[PDB]
Amino acid sequence: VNSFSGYLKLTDNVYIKNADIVEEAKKVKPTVVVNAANVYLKHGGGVAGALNKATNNAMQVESDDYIATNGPLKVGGSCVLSGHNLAKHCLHVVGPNVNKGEDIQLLKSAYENFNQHEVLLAPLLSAGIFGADPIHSLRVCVDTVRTNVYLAVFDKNLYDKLVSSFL
Numbered sequence: 433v434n435s436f437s438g439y440l441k442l443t444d445n446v447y448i449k450n451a452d453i454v455e456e457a458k459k460v461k462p463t464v465v466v467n468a469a470n471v472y473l474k475h476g477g478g479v480a481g482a483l484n485k486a487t488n489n490a491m492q493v494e495s496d497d498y499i500a501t502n503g504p505l506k507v508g509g510s511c512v513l514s515g516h517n518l519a520k521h522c523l524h525v526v527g528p529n530v531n532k533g534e535d536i537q538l539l540k541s542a543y544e545n546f547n548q549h550e551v552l553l554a555p556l557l558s559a560g561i562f563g564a565d566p567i568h569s570l571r572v573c574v575d576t577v578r579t580n581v582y583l584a585v586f587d588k589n590l591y592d593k594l595v596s597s598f599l
């Protein structure tokens with residue numbers, strides 16, 4: 433038994449809810465929140481801009497130190513940093529950005545990072561401002577992630593569409 437409430441169960445391990453991921457993290461304080469990061473950890477908008485704003489820019493300060501030491505992530509890769517006031521940890525995961533012409537096949541690699549964590553609160557990777565088809569992102573999530581994932585869909589009509597079209 434964990435602290436997540438109100439989710440629709442899609443599979444043995446994947447759950448979904450229409451939610452603002454910033455408000456859900458603040459309420460639950462999960463072990464792991466996933467950020468929809470870019471390779472530079474520049475948290476300007478979408479999930480990253482919203483998560484970073486909720487940390488009063490502390491996420492960006494920590495991220496800039498990480499990049500100054502390590503250089504950029506890979507598309508499909510991740511790093512674990514502080515969750516600040518939102519979570520114990522933040523798993524910054526880079527899905528491909530369709531708008532940058534990045535290979536959609538890297539979405540599966542991105543979701544494989546979730547398997548290193550028993551339970552996660554997450555967005556649909558490459559959805560929203562990343563430009564991928566969110567229905568595809570949910571299919572890759574279900575077919576890739578084996579650990580327990582609680583998905584936060586920001587858009588209502590998208591949430592209702594994801595549910596109603598789920599195989």
Ligand SMILES: O=C(O)Cc1noc2ccccc12
Nearest residue numbers: 559560566584585586587590
């Ligand atoms: O609903 C999401 O979580 C991201 C998203 N994916 O696609 C959308 C379209 C409009 C607004 C938001 C979105």
